Amino acid sequence: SVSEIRKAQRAEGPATILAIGTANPANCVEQSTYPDFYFKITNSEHKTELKEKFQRMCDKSMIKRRYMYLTEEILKENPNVCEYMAPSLDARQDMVVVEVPRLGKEAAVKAIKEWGQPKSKITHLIVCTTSGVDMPGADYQLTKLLGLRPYVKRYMMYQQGCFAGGTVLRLAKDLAENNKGARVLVVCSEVTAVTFRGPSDTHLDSLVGQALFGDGAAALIVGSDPVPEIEKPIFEMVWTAQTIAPDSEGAIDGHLREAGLTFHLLKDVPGIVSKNITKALVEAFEPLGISDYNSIFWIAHPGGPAILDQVEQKLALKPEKMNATREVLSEYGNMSSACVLFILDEMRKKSTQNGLKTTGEGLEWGVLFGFGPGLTIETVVLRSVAI
Amino acid sequence: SVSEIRKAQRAEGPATILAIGTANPANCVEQSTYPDFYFKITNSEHKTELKEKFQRMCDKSMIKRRYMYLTEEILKENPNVCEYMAPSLDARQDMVVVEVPRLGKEAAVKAIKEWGQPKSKITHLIVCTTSGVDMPGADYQLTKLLGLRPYVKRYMMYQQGCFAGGTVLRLAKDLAENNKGARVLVVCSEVTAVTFRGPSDTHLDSLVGQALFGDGAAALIVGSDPVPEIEKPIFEMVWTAQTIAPDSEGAIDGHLREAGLTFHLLKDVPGIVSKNITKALVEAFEPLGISDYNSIFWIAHPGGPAILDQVEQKLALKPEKMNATREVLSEYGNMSSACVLFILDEMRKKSTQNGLKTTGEGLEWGVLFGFGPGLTIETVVLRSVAI
Ligand SMILES: Oc1ccc(/C=C/c2cc(O)cc(O)c2)cc1
Ligand SMILES: Oc1ccc(/C=C/c2cc(O)cc(O)c2)cc1
């Protein structure tokens, strides 16, 4: 009796990305002049050596601009947020418990419009953020804000960190594939109000986050068994993995404290990622008989430019493999979990725009990686779609 | 090519609970004398009317004792934790980022011993808590503490609230069923260091949490396709749902602030649960042709005794249906997400102890419910196992 129920309940084909929409706070913050702004707004003009280090960090970041909910007016009204370490969680939380779902809604509406089907057909909702927590969560807020059915099955992923663009895909794959008819709205939405803080010369690692983190949200519709010529596949998920790199304890830490979310880098993250990326690639692609990593399309979380440079160096990737990744890092900075989903959007849009054969830059197979605390690597093996 | 991969990758039978282990902080806190202790340790002896209200709340709670990490010594060393609203998140976080995984490890070791198979066969790990957050999370800590493989696939569920015993089961079902060979360790671990606070006479709702919340962890092993006579099924999952009750906005709220995790009750939760439980039951059991709710075995989150009493009243359940639920509420109080998993353990152990025909009190089908913020109801339809 349960065998028959199980058989009828499950989907049949691979989880597929059917729509992608993104959104960012309207405030565009130029990187070239950020050092000057940031040292002024934090009342840190007298830390001249630290300022010169930050200017160097920003000039090497390979980020031209970021979008930030935080403005000069907001920062003036919250001096504790501008100090390196002052009680400020309540103020930050008040900002992000609202802005995370507001921004996620904007991205989600775009994805739902692209999908083109009734929102009442969304059966599952995954919401992911590293900024702020609340009860009921941002998943409940987004259900109310979008008018989803009350029986949407929710997955609230909080405080995950940068690898979680990969995690939401690994999660969505199983929800979609094990449930016939399931249609999963996936929303990653990240806002740096929780991480922004002033500079301190004995905390240079913290300072790196101030050069790299940006705001944004991305939404997907994921489903198996797409209805031919109603729904339009963009990418198919085939296999996923998550692992912890050896010898990386405490490489990236982040505590949610009375002074907001801190950020620490205690180890060489670019070196750890680069030393462990081959292992991740042969786990994923050796069963498919592929060993040429220039023959697949690439999406990599751009935690900072050095991760990308060292990966490309280690593997001998052609410089163009990381073009889609670098273009997102350039125009939006590191948006934690959302980043990789902006990169999928950029790649399929550019592939379509340029008349390539597939959504994966003309190639059949591809890989998406998330990197973050642990040190954690998430791997998602993708197959592109024709046209 | 992907069709063949998909076909080979998925499991075939229903997700099954193969082992359950639980654990609690060693400190046993008697309810009869709690009012006296709590008003003294919080320096609230002069709030005589409030004290009499709390004594009534504890005497009606139907809780005989709870286990708490917090002790008199710890409370003396943290006066801010004893005030109704004082900066104390950092201190609370320091307690629970350690104790959540420590306690989860204790429960997990018990479940793994019962399961009897190598821990290297755990492929997925779900960790769930409403107390504290950190990066890397309690899932990373539990992977290190237990010596799981580094490539265990982790699901960190933070700040979820009381319905999440149901949520981890809904999640584990899809992971197990869509992945051949998958074996999911599920750990809910809850510690009231984050919620404990002193009493305030204009915040009586908050005070209810102080009479009801307790500490504990529960762990499960979940898998499809149990290996005959190596692995031993206890309960099978068949169907799941999550929904938001109408007219319940703001019924239960909880914010993670500089003063720790607050708790508010703005609506009649027992009444909302009772008015919406029938709908949840016919969604679940009308497709199975069952309408007699005394004919199934019951597991219900015991948020407080009034929820149970009003459910039993609304449906005309025989008083014995809630025996397993009430026994856990009596001996451990409300342990948020872990509660329902302690109740499954109690029911299968008592059914086995008393020589009943099935693990579900001698009955074939059963239901598990979680209730929490939203107002959210999680439903899990279960099938028992013979013997
Ligand atoms: O908009 C956002 C963009 C990026 C971030 C990053 C936060 C973060 C904080 C850490 O301690 C660890 C880290 O791995 C990630 C948060 C918000
Ligand atoms: O050990 C524990 C036992 C219970 C709890 C409950 C916390 C909680 C706080 C709220 O604001 C909302 C609520 O629904 C749940 C936390 C720890």
Side-chain angles (χ1 to χ4, degrees):
Chain A
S1 232
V2 172
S3 256
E4 286 171 20
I5 292 169
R6 184 81 276 275
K7 251 146 188 23
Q9 196 182 76
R10 64 203 311 163
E12 68 193 328
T16 298
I17 299 175
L18 300 171
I20 312 165
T22 64
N24 303 81
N27 173 37
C28 185
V29 179
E30 292 298 299
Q31 189 78 320
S32 59
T33 60
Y34 193 67
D36 264 4
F37 173 82
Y38 171 79
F39 271 74
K40 163 182 90 224
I41 199 57
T42 63
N43 277 50
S44 289
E45 303 230 61
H46 61 294
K47 317 183 171 198
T48 275
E49 281 186 27
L50 189 54
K51 198 182 175 182
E52 300 167 355
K53 294 168 196 288
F54 193 59
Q55 183 74 52
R56 185 202 158 144
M57 293 183 179
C58 293
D59 296 342
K60 295 168 85 238
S61 63
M62 304 302 128
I63 298 167
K64 299 185 186 151
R65 48 203 145 307
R66 292 171 283 174
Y67 293 89
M68 306 190 174
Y69 164 85
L70 288 173
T71 63
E72 160 174 61
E73 191 192 41
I74 296 159
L75 289 174
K76 129 254 205 58
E77 302 178 3
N78 291 274
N80 277 18
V81 170
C82 302
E83 296 199 30
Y84 174 68
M85 202 67 57
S88 49
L89 179 70
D90 293 352
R92 294 162 181 283
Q93 285 269 65
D94 286 352
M95 299 169 188
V96 297
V97 163
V98 175
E99 180 67 2
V100 166
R102 192 202 59 80
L103 186 64
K105 178 188 172 171
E106 294 192 349
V109 158
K110 284 187 203 172
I112 293 162
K113 177 167 132 136
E114 172 184 357
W115 180 44
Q117 323 299 303
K119 67 184 162 55
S120 66
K121 303 265 233 129
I122 295 168
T123 55
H124 296 249
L125 171 67
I126 295 163
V127 180
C128 175
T129 185
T130 316
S131 43
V133 299
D134 197 26
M135 273 190 304
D139 58 314
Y140 165 88
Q141 299 300 341
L142 276 158
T143 295
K144 163 174 177 202
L145 285 169
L146 290 168
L148 298 187
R149 304 274 79 117
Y151 45 85
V152 62
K153 290 170 178 69
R154 295 167 284 125
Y155 298 80
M156 182 63 248
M157 300 313 290
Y158 267 134
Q159 208 65 56
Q160 316 269 315
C162 307
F163 57 78
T167 317
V168 300
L169 284 172
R170 172 162 58 81
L171 173 53
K173 180 181 186 290
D174 286 337
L175 302 184
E177 291 174 358
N178 200 45
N179 292 287
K180 178 203 56 149
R183 295 286 177 266
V184 189
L185 176 62
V186 180
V187 178
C188 293
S189 177
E190 292 295 8
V191 174
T192 54
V194 73
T195 56
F196 182 99
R197 56 190 69 258
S200 168
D201 60 17
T202 55
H203 304 103
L204 295 177
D205 59 333
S206 165
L207 194 65
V208 163
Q210 309 300 318
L212 296 178
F213 297 161
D215 301 358
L220 313 178
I221 294 292
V222 172
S224 297
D225 308 320
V227 183
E229 305 145 60
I230 290 179
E231 288 178 313
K232 160 188 203 217
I234 306 161
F235 290 106
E236 284 180 336
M237 283 191 274
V238 183
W239 178 99
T240 67
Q242 182 194 55
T243 192
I244 296 165
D247 300 319
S248 67
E249 184 165 20
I252 304 166
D253 291 337
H255 309 301
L256 189 63
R257 301 296 268 186
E258 289 176 39
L261 178 64
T262 63
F263 172 70
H264 326 285
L265 292 179
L266 311 171
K267 295 181 166 163
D268 178 3
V269 169
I272 291 170
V273 171
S274 287
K275 280 164 106 128
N276 285 278
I277 199 84
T278 301
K279 117 144 259 175
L281 291 163
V282 347
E283 170 156 26
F285 287 100
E286 204 73 16
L288 290 166
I290 116 91
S291 54
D292 174 5
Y293 308 130
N294 285 305
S295 78
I296 62 178
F297 58 89
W298 273 74
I299 299 93
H301 178 62
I307 297 178
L308 308 178
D309 289 349
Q310 285 179 41
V311 157
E312 153 174 345
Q313 277 158 227
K314 168 72 172 160
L315 299 173
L317 300 175
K318 309 197 167 162
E320 294 65 31
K321 307 304 299 177
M322 291 291 186
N323 275 358
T325 298
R326 281 179 200 284
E327 170 71 3
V328 172
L329 173 65
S330 182
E331 297 293 338
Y332 302 103
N334 173 353
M335 297 172 287
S336 185
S337 66
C339 232
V340 110
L341 305 187
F342 274 74
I343 303 167
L344 288 172
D345 196 32
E346 169 64 17
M347 179 183 291
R348 59 106 175 213
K349 278 167 162 63
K350 232 78 175 262
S351 297
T352 303
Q353 188 157 109
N354 291 349
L356 302 187
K357 290 305 189 50
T358 77
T359 52
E361 302 186 337
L363 308 173
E364 182 174 3
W365 292 98
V367 68
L368 174 153
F369 284 112
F371 315 113
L375 188 149
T376 299
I377 297 174
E378 291 267 7
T379 302
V380 182
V381 172
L382 299 164
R383 181 168 78 162
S384 69
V385 168
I387 261 44
Chain B
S1 232
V2 172
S3 256
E4 286 171 20
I5 292 169
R6 184 81 276 275
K7 251 146 188 23
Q9 196 182 76
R10 64 203 311 163
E12 68 193 328
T16 298
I17 299 175
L18 300 171
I20 312 165
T22 64
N24 303 81
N27 173 37
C28 185
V29 179
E30 292 298 299
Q31 189 78 320
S32 59
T33 60
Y34 193 67
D36 264 4
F37 173 82
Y38 171 79
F39 271 74
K40 163 182 90 224
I41 199 57
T42 63
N43 277 50
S44 289
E45 303 230 61
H46 61 294
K47 317 183 171 198
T48 275
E49 281 186 27
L50 189 54
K51 198 182 175 182
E52 300 167 355
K53 294 168 196 288
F54 193 59
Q55 183 74 52
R56 185 202 158 144
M57 293 183 179
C58 294
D59 296 342
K60 295 168 85 238
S61 63
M62 304 302 128
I63 298 167
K64 299 185 186 151
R65 48 203 145 307
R66 292 171 283 174
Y67 293 89
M68 306 190 174
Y69 164 85
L70 288 173
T71 63
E72 160 174 61
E73 191 192 41
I74 296 159
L75 289 174
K76 129 254 205 58
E77 302 178 3
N78 291 274
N80 277 18
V81 170
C82 302
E83 296 199 30
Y84 174 68
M85 202 67 57
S88 49
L89 179 70
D90 293 352
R92 294 162 181 283
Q93 285 269 65
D94 286 352
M95 299 169 188
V96 297
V97 163
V98 175
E99 180 67 2
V100 166
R102 192 202 59 80
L103 186 64
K105 178 188 172 171
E106 294 192 349
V109 158
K110 284 187 203 172
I112 293 162
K113 177 167 132 136
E114 172 184 357
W115 180 44
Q117 323 299 303
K119 67 184 162 55
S120 66
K121 303 265 233 129
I122 295 168
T123 55
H124 296 249
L125 171 67
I126 295 163
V127 180
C128 175
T129 185
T130 316
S131 43
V133 299
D134 197 26
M135 273 190 304
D139 58 314
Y140 165 88
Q141 299 300 341
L142 276 158
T143 295
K144 163 174 177 202
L145 285 169
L146 290 168
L148 298 187
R149 303 274 79 117
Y151 45 85
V152 62
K153 290 170 178 69
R154 295 167 284 125
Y155 298 80
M156 182 63 248
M157 300 313 290
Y158 267 134
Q159 208 65 56
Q160 316 269 315
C162 307
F163 57 78
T167 317
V168 300
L169 284 172
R170 172 162 58 81
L171 173 53
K173 180 181 186 290
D174 286 337
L175 302 184
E177 291 174 358
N178 200 45
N179 292 287
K180 178 203 56 149
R183 295 286 177 266
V184 189
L185 176 62
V186 180
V187 178
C188 293
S189 177
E190 292 295 8
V191 174
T192 54
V194 73
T195 56
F196 182 99
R197 56 190 69 258
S200 168
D201 60 17
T202 55
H203 304 103
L204 295 177
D205 59 333
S206 165
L207 194 65
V208 163
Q210 309 300 318
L212 296 178
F213 297 161
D215 301 358
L220 313 178
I221 294 292
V222 172
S224 297
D225 308 320
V227 183
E229 305 145 60
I230 290 179
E231 288 178 313
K232 160 188 203 217
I234 306 161
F235 290 106
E236 284 180 336
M237 283 191 274
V238 183
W239 178 99
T240 67
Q242 182 194 55
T243 192
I244 296 165
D247 300 319
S248 67
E249 184 165 20
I252 304 166
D253 291 337
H255 309 301
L256 189 63
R257 301 296 268 186
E258 289 176 39
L261 178 64
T262 63
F263 172 70
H264 326 285
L265 292 179
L266 311 171
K267 295 181 166 163
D268 178 3
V269 169
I272 291 170
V273 171
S274 287
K275 280 164 106 128
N276 285 278
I277 199 84
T278 301
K279 117 144 259 175
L281 291 163
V282 347
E283 170 156 26
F285 287 100
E286 204 73 16
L288 290 166
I290 116 91
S291 54
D292 174 5
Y293 308 130
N294 285 305
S295 78
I296 62 178
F297 58 89
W298 273 74
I299 299 93
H301 178 62
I307 297 178
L308 308 178
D309 289 349
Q310 285 179 41
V311 157
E312 153 174 345
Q313 277 158 227
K314 168 72 172 160
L315 299 173
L317 300 175
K318 309 197 167 162
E320 294 65 31
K321 307 304 299 177
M322 291 291 186
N323 275 358
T325 298
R326 281 179 200 284
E327 170 71 3
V328 172
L329 173 65
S330 182
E331 297 293 338
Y332 302 103
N334 173 353
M335 297 172 287
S336 185
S337 66
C339 232
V340 110
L341 305 187
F342 274 74
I343 303 167
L344 288 172
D345 196 32
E346 169 64 17
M347 179 183 291
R348 59 106 175 213
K349 278 167 162 63
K350 232 78 175 262
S351 297
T352 303
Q353 188 157 109
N354 291 349
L356 302 187
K357 290 305 189 50
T358 77
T359 52
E361 302 186 337
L363 308 173
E364 182 174 3
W365 292 98
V367 68
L368 174 153
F369 284 112
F371 315 113
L375 188 149
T376 299
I377 297 174
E378 291 267 7
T379 302
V380 182
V381 172
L382 299 164
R383 181 168 78 162
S384 69
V385 168
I387 261 44

